[PDB]
Structure 1
Amino acid sequence: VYIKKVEARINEEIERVMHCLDKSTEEPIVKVVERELISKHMKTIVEMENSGLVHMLKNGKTEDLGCMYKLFSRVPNGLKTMCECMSSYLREQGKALVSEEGEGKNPVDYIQGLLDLKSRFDRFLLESFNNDRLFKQTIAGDFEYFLNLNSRSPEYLSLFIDDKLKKGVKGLTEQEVETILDKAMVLFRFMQEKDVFERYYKQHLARRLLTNKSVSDDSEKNMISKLKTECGCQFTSKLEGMFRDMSISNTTMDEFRQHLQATGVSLGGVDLTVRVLTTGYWPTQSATPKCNIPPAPRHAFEIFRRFYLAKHSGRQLTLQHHMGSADLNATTRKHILQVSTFQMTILMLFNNREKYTFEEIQQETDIPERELVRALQSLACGKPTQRVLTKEPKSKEIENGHIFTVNDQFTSKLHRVKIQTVAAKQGESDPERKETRQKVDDDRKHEIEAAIVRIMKSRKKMQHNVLVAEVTQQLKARFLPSPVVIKKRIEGLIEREYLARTPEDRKVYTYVA
């Protein structure tokens, strides 16, 4: 109530001075009135206690913020401490929200709460501060400071954008989807370690375009559109190429059905769905193994390879097992199972000869490591009432003589019962993520090298190291996580011409290109 009272006091004072006194009469009067009232109340009335600035902002009082902004705008150094206290409250709320101590937090809920806080502060800004530049700059700096505290922030946002892109069940229409995507990219604008935001988003691209189809269709093009902008076309071309090559995949798969009606030598091609991707966009999962193939899939792969070598010469294909799925038609009804190009080999070995074992699926299969264990437990361990794979020596640990059996378990009347236990989420593990992020850092450092050297030899060379400032400015958001890789790189590179910088003679360099 003090602010309304001092506003009424200022109003009655200026009215008395303009009506009862002379014509100008106001400059020193209002100056001294401000210097006495506001310059004294500014320090203590907004921070002490009992509904000051922090409390009146926490409960969400719009009129209070508006009147405080319209009052403190007349006195200098008012907006300064105003934004200072606002940023202090923002830091407190962030440290209360970005708290890492404690496991069991939902990443999507965390990103949703962060976005809600951002939208609330933006609404308060637009409603009270009249879109002031200082408040925007301070909140931008605060979001830049408090967000890069955790390294899982880009990973948490990638999971959120994947949950929002996999299906538009919430917000069927396009307007709210557009708004939430704009808010998401705005939140990403003040984020760091965006190199793995892109690597984890490419991991999600692979998860949403290899384990399923028709994810969002037009909304994936909405994604490429909102991506082209953001930080500029430098990491967006990557996504462009990925989507162009998935289009290549679908077109080449139709081409395959078409001319398999041409390379048909067997009948293992009842229903085939082959996808053609490029290794320049999709990384190798673990090792690209070379396990065996069931006979009808053998004939299908042979037909596909013959077609791809006859009508698509100039490139050879490689076989793998760590990707895809299948529909195993079992048979009282005919319930069709599902094997992620994973349970196909084990179930085929069970067909060829039942009573198999670990010393049977690990010896005569050329099967990979613990990924095999996760693919195998999908049918036996942690199974509800759909356990189609049972065993005689039932034990948590896997010995070597555990014989296997198949249980009818007539419960799923649907003829499309699937066993999904693997790849529950997409959090991965600390080591592999770290090493691949270091690989992205080394790639960005090679980028630095190329850029700086080429530009300088045509566009202003340096004396010792002065344009290095420009090349790091070009890759600003993509510079942090790499340590001294850049230094070791430019060092190993000093060898031929078109680059000097030699610590012994770092003077004026050549001016070619």
Structure 2
Amino acid sequence: VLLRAVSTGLPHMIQELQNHIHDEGLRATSNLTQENMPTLFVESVLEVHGKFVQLINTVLNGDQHFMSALDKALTSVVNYREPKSVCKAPELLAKYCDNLLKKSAKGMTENEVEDRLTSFITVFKYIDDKDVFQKFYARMLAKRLIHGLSMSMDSEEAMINKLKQACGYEFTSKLHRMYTDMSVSADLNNKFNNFIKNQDTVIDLGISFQIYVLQAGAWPLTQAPSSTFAIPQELEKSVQMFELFYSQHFSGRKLTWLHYLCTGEVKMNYLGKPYVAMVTTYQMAVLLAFNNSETVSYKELQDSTQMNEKELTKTIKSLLDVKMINHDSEKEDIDAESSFSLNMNFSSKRTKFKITTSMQKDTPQEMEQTRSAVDEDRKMYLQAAIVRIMKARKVLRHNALIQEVISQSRARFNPSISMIKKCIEVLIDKQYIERSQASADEYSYVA
């Protein structure tokens, strides 16, 4: 009442409302979840944001001086903290979103979660991280989409929309295609069967048959060479035969190769009750070895396989550390024999822990390894960001740009202010009117 009655006080509130809200923003959002459980960090962002907004909820009664301070405060919370990495909240948000979006981590009732996500978006309005969040989430989502362990499809889409109204298009669009990719792809698998191998009558050996479009539009991944795999008949009939019908499916929508969808589900009646399960890659070869002989020696075998050994260091670490796999002999350079043992293991050693098997490392570790690359991508993103910003105005005065970029670069991605003159003079010099020198009148002419 006083600060309203006396004129000058409110801008001070602009000052004060940012600082402690920011300060606790260091601890309560950032410092409080080092443990790095994603749910915890999201809750921490919620903690600072909600608590302080509630502070505002009082007699402050809106009064935008207060809210603007709050806007700056949260901007400071996510952005301004000691760690340069702004994406940590979105990193923990992405994982958490997947957690909410999957049946695995947290089971809840449908669309209540939407409500929770709604509150998340509300807090999210301040956050700048779409590169990590969108791409990395799409990446994790792609992996989980391969997994299929999801709470639901539509709610995921709802979360997408929550972002979508507010955010950039391709960020959403690629995911849309990824979603549709899976959907239409399942339809495609049905089609691929349905031409000759109808629902009832299939003229094929039959491994699980599912694949995606293998198109340029769907994926967030980068380029990494894989090893040379023999790819047997069932693998052939799943994919390659598909390539035949794929021409029938898409004539003109060409192929970007993706083996990763090779599907396998085993229904085996070894013991009275058909069991559907999933297992590793090597013993299958051993089974093949068994059909033909008892053993397949590594000399000819190695001669036959010739895997590209880029990844092998990580592979070796994983195979040696696991020791879950029934193998002949694991040696450093070359394993002399690959005619692996019988079904030695079941799900777990102990019940408290000592739980860990199927082979985990390839699965969550990829990003773990990729972080160097992703951060490099962050660097690239920033580079692209300056590029994206700097292209905007053809004829201007330099001062005119001021306070323009803030609209484009604040909330969506992390701001990069310092690059302006350098970017103009270095990048922009192509077909444009250049003011390298503002005083004199002259510059570049387009062809």
Matched, 1:283 2:220: yes
Deviation of residue 501 (structure 1)? 0.8
Deviation of residue 502 (structure 1)? 6.0
Structure 1 gap ranges (5+): 1-69
| Cα distance between partner residues in 2 of 1:278 and 1:490 | 38
Name 1:501's counterpart in structure 2.
434
Q: Is the 8 A contact 1:95 1:146 kept in 2?
A: yes
Name 1:292's counterpart in structure 2.
230
Decide whether aligned partners of structure 1 residues 107 and 300 sit closer, same or farther in structure 2, where only a CA change above 3 A counts.
closer
Bigger mean CA deviation after superposition, 226-235 or 358-367 = 358-367
Bigger mean CA deviation after superposition, 215-224 or 99-108 = 99-108
3-state SS of 2:217 partner = coil
Out of 90, 95, 120, the position equivalent to 2:21 is 90
CA offset digits 1:429-483 (Å, max 9, x no partner): 432112222333344445345543xxx3xxxx22567458646744444362697
Deviation of residue 203 (structure 1)? 1.0
Name 1:9's counterpart in structure 2.
none
| Cα distance between partner residues in 1 of 2:402 and 2:64 | 31
For 2:67, give the aligned amino acid.
Answer: K
Out of 305, 309, 323, the position equivalent to 1:365 is 305
Q: Is the 8 A contact 1:107 1:159 kept in 2?
A: yes
Decide whether aligned partners of structure 1 residues 481 and 210 sit closer, same or farther in structure 2, where only a CA change above 3 A counts.
farther
Which has the higher relative contact order, 1 or 2, with Cα contacts under 8 A spaced 6 or more apart? Answer: 2
Name 1:268's counterpart in structure 2.
205
| Cα distance between partner residues in 2 of 1:103 and 1:121 | 22
Matched, 1:136 2:71: no
Aligned length: 420
For 2:133, give the aligned amino acid.
Answer: F
CA offset digits 1:80-126 (Å, max 9, x no partner): 55564554332332222355699643233122122133223223322
Decide whether aligned partners of structure 1 residues 111 and 214 sit closer, same or farther in structure 2, where only a CA change above 3 A counts.
closer
Q: What is the TM-score normalised by the length of structure 1?
A: 0.67
| Cα distance between partner residues in 2 of 1:283 and 1:441 | 18
Matched, 1:480 2:415: yes
Q: Is the 8 A contact 1:91 1:146 kept in 2?
A: yes
Deviation of residue 192 (structure 1)? 2.5
Name 2:322's counterpart in structure 1.
382
Name 1:437's counterpart in structure 2.
378
Matched, 1:307 2:245: yes
For 2:187, give the aligned amino acid.
Answer: T
Matched, 1:112 2:47: no
Deviation of residue 213 (structure 1)? 5.8
Q: Is the 8 A contact 2:128 2:414 kept in 1?
A: no
For 1:117, give the aligned amino acid.
Answer: V
Q: What is the TM-score normalised by the length of structure 2?
A: 0.76
Structure 2 gap ranges (5+): 349-355
Deviation of residue 219 (structure 1)? 0.3
1:66-465 correspondence to structure 2 within 5 Å: 73-81=4-12, 84-97=15-28, 104-148=35-79, 149=81, 150=83, 151=85, 152-167=88-103, 169-174=106-111, 176-212=112-148, 215-231=151-167, 233=169, 235-261=171-197, 267-269=204-206, 271-287=208-224, 289=226, 290-323=228-261, 325-328=263-266, 331-332=270-271, 335-339=275-279, 343-344=280-281, 346-353=282-289, 355=295, 364-369=304-309, 371=311, 381-382=321-322, 387=324, 389-393=325-329, 400-401=335-336, 403=338, 405-409=340-344, 411=346, 419-422=358-361, 423-424=363-364, 427-448=368-389, 450-452=391-393, 456=394, 461-463=395-397
Q: Is the 8 A contact 1:210 1:324 kept in 2?
A: no
CA offset digits 1:471-508 (Å, max 9, x no partner): 6744444362697499458635534x4x1316369848
Asked which structure has the greater CA Rg, the reply is 1
Decide whether aligned partners of structure 1 residues 443 and 337 sit closer, same or farther in structure 2, where only a CA change above 3 A counts.
same
Aligned identity (percent) is: 25
Bigger mean CA deviation after superposition, 190-199 or 425-434 = 425-434
Q: Is the 8 A contact 1:449 1:489 kept in 2?
A: yes
| Cα distance between partner residues in 1 of 2:429 and 2:303 | 51
For 1:305, give the aligned amino acid.
Answer: E
Name 2:426's counterpart in structure 1.
491
Q: Is the 8 A contact 2:42 2:93 kept in 1?
A: yes
Deviation of residue 403 (structure 1)? 4.9
